Amino acid sequence: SQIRQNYSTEVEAAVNRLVNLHLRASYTYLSLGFFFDRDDVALEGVGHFFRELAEEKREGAERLLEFQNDRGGRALFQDVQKPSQDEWGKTQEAMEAALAMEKNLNQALLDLHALGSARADPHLCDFLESHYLDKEVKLIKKMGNHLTNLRRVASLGEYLFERLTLK
Amino acid sequence: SQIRQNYSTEVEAAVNRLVNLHLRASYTYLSLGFFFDRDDVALEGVGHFFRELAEEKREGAERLLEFQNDRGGRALFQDVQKPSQDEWGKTQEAMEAALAMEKNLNQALLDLHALGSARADPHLCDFLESHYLDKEVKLIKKMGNHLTNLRRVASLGEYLFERLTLK
Amino acid sequence: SQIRQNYSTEVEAAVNRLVNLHLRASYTYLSLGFFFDRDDVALEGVGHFFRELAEEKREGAERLLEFQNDRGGRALFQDVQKPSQDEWGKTQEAMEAALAMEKNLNQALLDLHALGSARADPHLCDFLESHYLDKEVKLIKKMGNHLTNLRRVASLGEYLFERLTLK
Amino acid sequence: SQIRQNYSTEVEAAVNRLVNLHLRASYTYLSLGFFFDRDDVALEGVGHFFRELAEEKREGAERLLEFQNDRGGRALFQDVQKPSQDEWGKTQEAMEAALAMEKNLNQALLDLHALGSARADPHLCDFLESHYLDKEVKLIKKMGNHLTNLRRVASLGEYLFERLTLK
Amino acid sequence: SQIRQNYSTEVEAAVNRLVNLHLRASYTYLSLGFFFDRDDVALEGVGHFFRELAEEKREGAERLLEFQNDRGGRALFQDVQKPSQDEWGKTQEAMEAALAMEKNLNQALLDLHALGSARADPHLCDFLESHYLDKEVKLIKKMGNHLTNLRRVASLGEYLFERLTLK
Amino acid sequence: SQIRQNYSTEVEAAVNRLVNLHLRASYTYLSLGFFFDRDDVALEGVGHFFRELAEEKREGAERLLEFQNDRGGRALFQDVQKPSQDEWGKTQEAMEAALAMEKNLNQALLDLHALGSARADPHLCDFLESHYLDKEVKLIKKMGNHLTNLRRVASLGEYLFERLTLK
Structure with a gap:
């Protein structure tokens, strides 16, 4: 590459x-989002929370692909494996799977x-610190807060958490 | 499903x-879009054209997933296979691959x-006619128009097509 | 902590x-600020300069406490020791104490x-670089500028510095 | 002091x-506020309630320091002792500690x-009546109301109080 | 220096x-800019592209001089050597010289x-990452894109690139 | 040159x-400007006065380069020699050096x-009269006024001149 340097x-x-x-995380969030919109699950706020995250993870992938081109590397795509589960359980179990992911x-x-x-x-290090590391810390903190509240309300409590925290 | 009927x-x-x-088509458009943004390809309008299509195809997938839940079926995800190529050639060859897709x-x-x-x-038939079939006819017509103009300008002509049609 | 990672x-x-x-620095600035507002000191601009810094230092403490929770650590508070002096002398001596602090x-x-x-x-390193290190360099430069001007005017000059620089 | 009179x-x-x-009360409220923002506590409204009080108590201290200078006395600072606890329990126990404080x-x-x-x-008496005594009566009444509601909802009720009263 | 620390x-x-x-780079861009405005070269968009870069490089120098003073070091100036060439050739050759610079x-x-x-x-490291390293990566990527398009249009193509990309 | 006439x-x-x-004068003003922003000099108004002049002198150079091309001559750049001093003394000595320059x-x-x-x-003569000669007379008069006031206040007076005339 005519532009490649220190890469x-x-x-x-x-x-x-x-x-x-x-992309794998985005796809898992897509599956979580639609599972919570099933008529026999029906927790709109939970579905919305995960669909927003499917977008965020995809955006994280696209920003990395731009960085690859900006530094002169070559984007190479692999299959996006399907999510680990087809059904995600109650809100707390789904949120625990998201935290682990x-x-x-x-x-x-x-x-x-x-x-x-x-x-x-250093350009890579700044890129990650500026656009990824604090976003992850803040998201993981938010999921930990949500899990604590889901345990607190544990069902009627699950309904109330979707209505009053999510939304 | 308590809601399922005639499905x-x-x-x-x-x-x-x-x-x-x-989703496979969306992923192929993501790869096309970033290939045209490589510094050794650098056809911004071509990259933008395909990135917009990556979004449209993803939206088509999400609308189908909503339809699945609206009718009481169960969304089941499979791997999203990687695109057919890692490098997409000149604009005309890429556009020919998109038309075939x-x-x-x-x-x-x-x-x-x-x-x-x-x-x-009939609800499925209306769904497809209303949100998919004419979108495909119009997109395929647009790609055919673009291929005719890429053949007409066939290099300097490829640059001019990106500048004056795409942009 | 369910959220703790690499901490x-x-x-x-x-x-x-x-x-x-x-918090110790904020408390020292609180004492500096009220000393300069004594009727037998009465340098309003000097008092304001240090009171603003009492707020900034407190905010720095609160941001660190948020970071502690965001990473899963546990905030533990200790006594805030009283400032090193009860009386802070003329503007230059007070500003020299602030620079050393x-x-x-x-x-x-x-x-x-x-x-x-x-x-x-790296998340800690970015946190400090983003919210603390340049703030300190800029503040220390400002205090050095002020000390040079206080030495330049060295009393009537102290009054004029409070009126015309502070402000 | 040239200004001191009847002081x-x-x-x-x-x-x-x-x-x-x-300042001791403000510091205790700072500790309460950050405890309720821990990921394993996570009661945002409770944390906000106490952080607002940390500000109010600090402001009460600063107003007293201004009064000291306005009357010709000399502000003398002592250590701010650390709060009585490192962990504050459930909302009701924390609110009981705040009421006692x-x-x-x-x-x-x-x-x-x-x-x-x-x-x-009389100037001191008016100062206290005008800026402190009714503020304390109103705050203590509010905390008593909150404790009665926390006892009423006594866990899911603690979550609902944070969501519907605090937020 | 009274302010110097860790420098x-x-x-x-x-x-x-x-x-x-x-400053050497800024001066080279000044020479490039005026060469493209000669009546026997006359590529306004090329001249503008390089004049904008003369400003950016000068600004980069001035920001470094401010950093020098902010950390307590002493700015020392040396001659600004004249650019490597008096005449810069066609757009592609000039752009290749700029990329190498x-x-x-x-x-x-x-x-x-x-x-x-x-x-x-770390304050120096953050300074460079925040104001220099990504600016260089983005500029070098842009120049690589421009060179690819100048090779694509390679004269009439040079005129069209100045008209339709620069602009 | 196809355009050259009477040149x-x-x-x-x-x-x-x-x-x-x-350009040599602009560079000297750049050095003067940053010297007055050193923490051990710290005369902001003096630094600003000279930085503004660094811009004006550079603009004078760029206007001459445009004139060179407008008349068909060929811009040829030489090294920009470093300023005559590394340190510029008190305001009056710096202003005396600027007046001589x-x-x-x-x-x-x-x-x-x-x-x-x-x-x-005559086109050259009008160019100089219109854009250079009166600018120089006015600037030299301003510097003479400033030197008279710096002598008048001659230290505390130097501080007051920076505060009340410059700024």
């Missing part, structure tokens, strides 16, 4: 894997940051 | 496959309409 | 100490950044 | 102690008013 | 050299970031 | 030297006007 092949490949992980994604982002540090790629 | 299992399954086909998607929509006719599901 | 106990404890150091606070922030680097906590 | 040393010293008591602060304000009466300092 | 002499000197390199400047910025990392100067 | 090679060369002299630049402009008169180039 390792190791980081280029890890960026492509992180795009895939964000975000902590996994956060660890992948931290791993890429450590790789960028090891390869002395 | 065959055959149509429910075909709806799930059509969701997957729309849309004609394939159109035939899948027509096949589902024929299935809905055979199963006497 | 060392060493950083958690240092965050609590840095909260205390910011800010350089001390800056070194504590730099020490926490070095700890975050050693523990590979 | 006893006994009142000057009691004003300094009351400043400290207000406000009744203690109210008694200190009443004691200072009695001292001002004994020393025939 | 190495090595970084102070490298900051002064980087100021000079930015920006990659050189980017490497100097990356070298200073590595020096700041080695000396544990 | 001597002697004037073309003198225009290039005058561009260089304006402007009188030198004014004499160079007058010399070019005399050359244009000798070569019967």
